[PDB]
Amino acid sequence: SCATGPRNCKDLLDRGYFLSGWHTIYLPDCRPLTVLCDMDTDGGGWTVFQRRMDGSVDFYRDWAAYKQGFGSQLGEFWLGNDNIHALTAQGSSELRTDLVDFEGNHQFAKYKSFKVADEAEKYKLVLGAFVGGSAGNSLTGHNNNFFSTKDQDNDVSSSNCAEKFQGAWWYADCHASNLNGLYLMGPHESYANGINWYKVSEMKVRPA
Ligand SMILES: [Ca+2]
């Protein structure tokens, strides 16, 4: 039960769960949640809240969908903004992004602290300093921005960033598209495949 169950993937690693995969954790209000643990990357104990790999799941979804979460444990998913808030509520948390391009090259980015506020604060992003990574720093000008979806424009642009990129994100100005954008499905031989920060994305969190 909640009293003796784990709170996140770090707890699970401590209890001797050394393989990546889906496990039950208990949120701070004791709601059980099935989450994806990354037990291999950068010491392990990461809870994965976004994963894309093939563009099979539609990410151009409304506020309610992003709030609750959507997709498949067997594939691509967004864990849900209520859930991401719950995971980053207690204590301090670190963010990691892992990316794979179409030629098999692995890249990454790491951030000191990562919090998303509750729905009353439009799931505002509270992001710490870029700690480093080969993928580069793309979430630099995103700190303090509200979350935006197609039906809820909370950006600081005259346009609807979510519509214009076709995905939901903590948009400010929208000069480029993000990890939740269109997953291009063009000829296998061309550049017009994947997403921008390109074949694979994973966003994940761990106690700092
Ligand atoms: Ca706008």
Integer Cα distance of 16 and 12 in angstroms: 7
CATH number at residue 141: 4.10.530.10
Any binding-site annotation on 153? yes
Q: How far is the CA of 157 from the centre of ligand 1 (A)?
A: 4
Q: Are residues 124 and 206 in the same domain?
A: yes
Question: Residue 35 has what DSSP assignment?
Answer: E
Integer Cα distance of 81 and 186 in angstroms: 30
Non-local (6+) Cβ contacts of 186 within 8 A are 192, 193
Integer Cα distance of 149 and 168 in angstroms: 5
- Domain that residue 24 falls in: 1-135+200-208
Q: Are residues 22 and 109 in the same domain?
A: yes
Q: How far is the CA of 62 from the centre of ligand 1 (A)?
A: 15
Q: Do the Cβ atoms of 80 and 69 come closer than 8 Å?
A: yes
Enter the resolution in angstroms: 1.7
Q: How many domains does the chain have?
A: 2
Query: Is 190 exposed, middle or buried, given 0-12, 13-18 or 19+ CB atoms closer than 10 A?
Result: exposed
Any binding-site annotation on 37? no
Instruction: Report the candidate in 142, 138, 146, 108 with the shortest Cα–Cα distance to residue 127.
Output: 142
Q: How far is the CA of 162 from the centre of ligand 1 (A)?
A: 9
Any binding-site annotation on 62? no
Q: Are residues 81 and 113 in the same domain?
A: yes
Q: Are residues 76 and 35 in the same domain?
A: yes
Q: How far is the CA of 122 from the centre of ligand 1 (A)?
A: 14
Q: Are residues 122 and 144 in the same domain?
A: no
Q: Write down the number of H helices and E strands in the chain.
A: 4, 13
CATH number at residue 55: 3.90.215.10
Q: Are residues 96 and 124 in the same domain?
A: yes
Q: Is the dihedral of CA 70, 113, 120, 23 positive or negative?
A: positive
Q: Are residues 147 and 112 in the same domain?
A: no
Q: Are residues 37 and 116 in the same domain?
A: yes
Q: How far is the CA of 156 from the centre of ligand 1 (A)?
A: 5
> What stretches of 27-185 adopt beta strand conformation (E)?
32-38, 46-52, 70-71, 77-78, 93-100, 106-111, 114-116, 125-127, 130-132, 184-185
